[PDB]
Design a protein around this ligand. Sequence first.
Ligand SMILES: Cc1cc2nc3c(=O)[nH]c(=O)nc-3n(C[C@H](O)[C@H](O)[C@H](O)COP(=O)(O)O)c2cc1C
Ligand SMILES: Cc1cc2nc3c(=O)[nH]c(=O)nc-3n(C[C@H](O)[C@H](O)[C@H](O)COP(=O)(O)O)c2cc1C
Ligand SMILES: [Cl-]
Lengths: 376, 374
Amino acid sequence: NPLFSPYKMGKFNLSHRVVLAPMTRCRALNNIPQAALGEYYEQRATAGGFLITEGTMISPTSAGFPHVPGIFTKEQVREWKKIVDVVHAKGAVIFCQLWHVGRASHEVYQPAGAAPISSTEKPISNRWRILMPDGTHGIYPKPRAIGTYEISQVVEDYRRSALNAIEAGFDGIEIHGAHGYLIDQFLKDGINDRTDEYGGSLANRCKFITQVVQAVVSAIGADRVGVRVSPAIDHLDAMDSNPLSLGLAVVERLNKIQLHSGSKLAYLHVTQPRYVAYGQTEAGRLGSEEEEARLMRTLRNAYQGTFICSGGYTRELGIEAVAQGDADLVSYGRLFISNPDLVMRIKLNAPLNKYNRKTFYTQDPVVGYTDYPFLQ
Amino acid sequence: PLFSPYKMGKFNLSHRVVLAPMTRCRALNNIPQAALGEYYEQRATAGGFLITEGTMISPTSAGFPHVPGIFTKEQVREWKKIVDVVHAKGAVIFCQLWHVGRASHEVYQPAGAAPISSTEKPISNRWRILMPDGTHGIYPKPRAIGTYEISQVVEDYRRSALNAIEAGFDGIEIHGAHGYLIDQFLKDGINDRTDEYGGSLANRCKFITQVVQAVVSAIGADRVGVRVSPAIDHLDAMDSNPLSLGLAVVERLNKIQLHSGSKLAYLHVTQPRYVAYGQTEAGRLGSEEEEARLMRTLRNAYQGTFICSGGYTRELGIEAVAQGDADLVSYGRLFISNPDLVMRIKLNAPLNKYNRKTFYTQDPVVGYTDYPFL
Ligand SMILES: Cc1cc2nc3c(=O)[nH]c(=O)nc-3n(C[C@H](O)[C@H](O)[C@H](O)COP(=O)(O)O)c2cc1C
Ligand SMILES: Cc1cc2nc3c(=O)[nH]c(=O)nc-3n(C[C@H](O)[C@H](O)[C@H](O)COP(=O)(O)O)c2cc1C
Ligand SMILES: [Cl-]
């Protein structure tokens, strides 16, 4: 089983290639990591296994979900420390994902009920909803387009949060630059309608992610920085006219940062679109995943370093990915929510527990969080 | 509730369990076979309603191998034999008229002509077609038919509906869903025409209206059912406002009934069962709520019998009928493996699992008529 051949990610000697994908769960009450998070990550930690935390706030305006943890205050750093320690005690490697949602927020999540910030004044359309604190779905509002100086301030928020993650003991950080969030709002030409140096050309649209990555790299070292993007996922109206061209443009910027820094990043993590095959239709089962696979393979081939694939992977698809050289590591989200011992279940080819979407974002410290059972 | 009798026009149905139309590819060389007779006979029940697999309305309307047609007198002759066996068991049966539009291939095109459609745009690479040898083929570039050709395709539906009646069917169902010909005109994500049949919702609905009117004027509204799927992920068939499109179709169907002075047999709607973006943070938020509203809105708007389909089980079907969401529920996959699904559902008995591997094979028995009764 290729998922169990060891992999050397920088200094880290991973014992297997099954990675815990970053997943927002909303148990960090009032943005403070809670003991429940410690139990949750400890359940999933394995010796030589790599874990990525849920998206974590880099500032007071960075959230668009309730009770997501932050790492911009010392109080938050002290609580993260306890989680990092328990995970390290199991022999796992863990990175903290730094997340700013940009326009994907609501006044209820902003200080003084201010408008969310973004590259643009254009709001996410009503084709999408936001989870409100009371559990209902809300409408995304119009964001405020930020200027060059404020952009440098947000970059500084990433730098300060990366330093704090290192202070908490994390092995590194992952820049959430995917799924239509703040960085993707600058990358995607379907969102970025700016006329200044951060808009228009591919170079201009890639300026923001480059500045963010360079700032964290210069603060903690490229080896402790992973980058996540999703050029072909249009979640929250984040489409680009040419996904592959955009993805390759980002990859070249990362390749350039590495050469200039004289060091490689921890990895490039890419989420791919995954089309569920509907069995109730005439030709749903006759589809092909070919094209989306070629896009992923091209980004991996273009990138000089470790590649982590994600998005609807199963045991069989993960084995295939590593076996064909399409990826070095494979991250799993939903199956890891319901299978604390996912790594062991994939090693033994055991049945996998079903997951309950209803409790993905609820606040209970146990229910739908740490009560999914281990192999008996 | 599924066994509470239902009156569908002049049809007194004994239960609400319907056999959904399902392509099975056993009609060798497009001619109905004795096998189909046994297959349908097996699932037929006294006072039960069945809808046949999609059936060709012209030589160029197919996109699957060995699907039956009803555009030749020979085909009509063989269908009659099947219809008789079904009536013998006291069941009501409608023949579904199917034209795939752009969802075709050169191998299914007698004159090597490009498949016809509303647009010049080909189905995307992520969708494939089933080839005669069982392999998957690539969808070719279709031809955006001219305004004048639309009338002749409507004529193909009309002649086919007449042929279905000549064959003895109690009625016909217009397949206007799942990204096939009619749906290629309805969905603004496909229809990029700038003429009378493109642009406004009204213009987009012109084709299905003309098809339904032609068949209604040929055999009577009481013998015509119509199937649509305002919101479905199949062969790149998307629309900006699924609700608006669905209600536009319902409004024109209601008008055809008023002007005809008789109601259609029913409106058949596929349940979206939308599951896109499950791998994202917010993709699924509000999805289930929107499709539920979409369906109830259409059900409340349509003046007549409403049949739901797509992902239904014994429990989900019971719920649909109990909550007033649908009058009849059609089952597809479970009916493939459970010939006596009706009886089984009635007794809450164990259901047989189905083998997809044999959904479209040509064996007249294996995976077709060999599923056990129990
Ligand atoms: C409940 C949930 C929360 C998520 N939260 C995040 C997040 O905070 N950051 C991120 O980059 N991706 C997030 N994702 C996307 C996942 O990291 C991952 O790409 C996806 O779950 C992989 O597909 P899979 O679930 O089929 O394994 C989330 C996904 C789910 C289902
Ligand atoms: C093998 C197969 C063939 C189908 N063929 C057709 C068809 O020719 N026409 C049509 O309108 N729907 C067709 N359908 C869709 C079904 O009528 C029905 O909506 C679907 O099977 C219902 O979902 P269920 O299988 O979960 O009950 C087909 C479905 C399957 C699984
Ligand atoms: Cl390191």
